[PDB]
Design a protein around this ligand. Structure first.
Ligand SMILES: Cc1cc2nc3c(=O)[nH]c(=O)nc-3n(C[C@H](O)[C@H](O)[C@H](O)COP(=O)(O)OP(=O)(O)OC[C@H]3O[C@@H](n4cnc5c(N)ncnc54)[C@H](O)[C@@H]3O)c2cc1C
Ligand SMILES: [Mn+2]
Length: 498
């Protein structure tokens, strides 16, 4: 049916948008292709852990996969599974695999919780048409509060076995002159202390994160989406995937929407129309909808920037082998707390997560997810034959990212007399994983495919809200930026357009 506003998806951009729309009195329907994650499963928990993956781990795959970096220890727990509407989707393109959440809350269900503001000077570099004072004075603080960002207690961090892995990399980095920083998070660190004390059910301290956290993590279903539902003006329909978008002859937008069951069986195809349409389907999903609409003629006045300007936030994974006297511990919290800040906006910049590993026995490995500054960009190109927008990115386009990550970690290896691991990513000697992405950014870039508030060029009352707006790179883990930009955008759109 008709609803005044429709929001596609339920990740960060969508959730911010729907809350503010509901508070403005606009009746809003959110359409989410994944599940509402609230049913206890066969182990009694909503989500599977990383040591007991099952069909809940995976969006329509027939075998579970180890978390990147951990195949050598976690392949032993992999199993064949039925294709199911599980929580983590590895989306395979020709030379890049992008990992995204599927469910009410999007990537907030599966991510590491790390809530980090970009460097202002870098924000000003990447988005010069945006007023940076309103961002830092108003919208970043708003996002910080609504997301429930909190900070680890330094004494607990220093003392607990669960963060030895982080302390080891801190000491190694320091020998190279390189500094670390604490990482704020939406996982409740008070709760985490109580997990370590045996006082509450474990989640971060029971090898859970990438298939969801059964406790502790304030994903968007608990924060923005709960508040949106609380307005009385927002509803969410799950297992509903938008397939096509058109402008109707009488104005507004009409959507074709498939309703499936959790086995992927098609139950219904619905037509849903609206006055205001907000896309929050992610970098991949929003871009695909718009490239499809342009190239199949349902939104023919979309511009040539739709599809362009994608980058993986410079994501590169690598690992170092510690000396035998620097074990990282069998018990590693699944939530990172420390990073190495070597980001000065130059082409050598690196912001690298000190990543836990879930093996649960001693491996001596330190793992890192580096964020780098690499100008290469890809384009999503519609394939009418298969009805899919294909990402044309080639692995050689990550060479600048590898080079930057390697230069930084070479400094650490030289100072400490250590070497890389070469065997964590596959059998071929490969120290740098260069064909994955957790942080897809771009495809519908702010001010190029859209105006400076995400209004899609060529159309009225058509908005993009999410990671597709960002120009390929933010220099930090991206959800705080997506959230704050969405706060800015929806406030302005409601004031001027609604
Ligand atoms: C393993 C992993 C670790 C990460 N760790 C961090 C971290 O610690 N901190 C950080 O800042 N970022 C992290 N990220 C990145 C962060 O999660 C994403 O940047 C963020 O979720 C993107 O928000 P979004 O609103 O653009 O889209 P998403 O959160 O991806 O949400 C899009 C939603 O739209 C739905 N959808 C898509 N297409 C359709 C359609 N056609 N119809 C209906 N629904 C649709 C999806 O199912 C999904 O629920 C991580 C991500 C992963 C995968
Ligand atoms: Mn704070």
């Amino acid at each position: 049916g008709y609803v005044p506003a429709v929001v596609i998806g339920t990740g960060y951009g969508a959730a911010v948008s729907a809350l503010r729309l509901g508070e403005a009195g606009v009746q809003t329907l959110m359409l989410e292709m994944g599940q509402l994650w609230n049913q206890p499963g066969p182990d009694g928990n909503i989500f599977c852990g990383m040591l007991n993956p099952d069909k809940r781990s995976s969006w329509f795959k027939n075998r579970t996969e180890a978390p990147l970096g951990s195949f050598l220890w976690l392949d032993v727990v992999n199993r064949n599974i039925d294709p199911y509407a599980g929580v983590l989707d590895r989306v395979n393109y020709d030379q890049m695999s992008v990992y995204v959440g599927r469910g009410v809350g999007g990537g907030s269900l599966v991510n590491g919780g790390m809530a980090v503001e970009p460097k202002r000077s870098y924000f000003e570099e990447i988005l010069p048409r945006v007023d940076s004072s309103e961002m830092y004075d108003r919208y970043f603080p708003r996002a910080n509060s609504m997301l429930r960002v909190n900070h680890i207690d330094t004494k607990w961090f220093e003392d607990t076995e669960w963060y030895k892995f982080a302390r080891v990399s801190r000491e190694q980095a320091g020998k190279a002159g390189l500094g670390t920083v604490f990482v704020p998070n939406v996982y409740d660190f008070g709760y985490m202390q109580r997990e370590a004390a045996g006082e509450v059910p474990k989640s971060a301290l029971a090898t859970e994160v990438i298939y969801g956290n059964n406790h502790g993590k304030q994903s968007l279903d608990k924060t923005y989406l709960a508040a949106a539902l609380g307005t009385g003006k927002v509803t969410i329909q799950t297992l509903h995937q938008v397939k096509t978008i058109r402008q109707t002859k009488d104005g507004g937008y009409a959507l074709t929407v498939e309703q499936k069951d959790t086995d992927g069986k098609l139950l219904a195809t619905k037509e849903i129309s609206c006055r205001y349409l907000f896309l929050g389907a992610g970098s991949l999903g929003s871009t695909e909808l718009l490239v499809r609409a342009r190239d199949t003629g349902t939104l023919p006045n979309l511009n040539s920037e739709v599809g362009a300007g994608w980058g993986p936030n410079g994501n590169i994974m690598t690992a170092r082998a510690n000396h035998m006297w620097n074990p990282t511990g069998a018990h590693q919290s699944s939530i990172p707390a420390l990073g190495i800040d070597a980001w000065d906006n130059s082409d050598s910049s690196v912001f690298a997560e000190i990543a836990p590993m879930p093996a649960g026995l001693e491996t001596w490995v330190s793992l890192y997810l580096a964020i780098t500054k690499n100008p290469q960009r890809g384009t999503f190109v519609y394939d009418a034959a298969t009805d899919r927008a294909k990402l044309n990115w080639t692995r050689d386009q990550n060479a600048p990212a590898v080079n930057a990550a390697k230069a930084l970690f070479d400094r650490i290896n030289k100072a400490n007399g250590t070497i890389y691991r070469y065997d964590l990513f596959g059998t071929q000697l490969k120290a740098f994983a260069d064909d994955f992405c957790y942080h897809p950014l771009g495809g519908c870039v702010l001010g190029k495919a859209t105006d400076d508030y995400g209004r899609v060029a060529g159309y009225k009352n058509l908005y993009v809200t999410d990671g597709s707006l960002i120009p390929g790179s933010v220099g930090v883990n991206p959800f705080v930026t997506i959230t704050a930009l969405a706060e800015r955008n929806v406030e302005r759109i409601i004031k001027q357009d609604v």
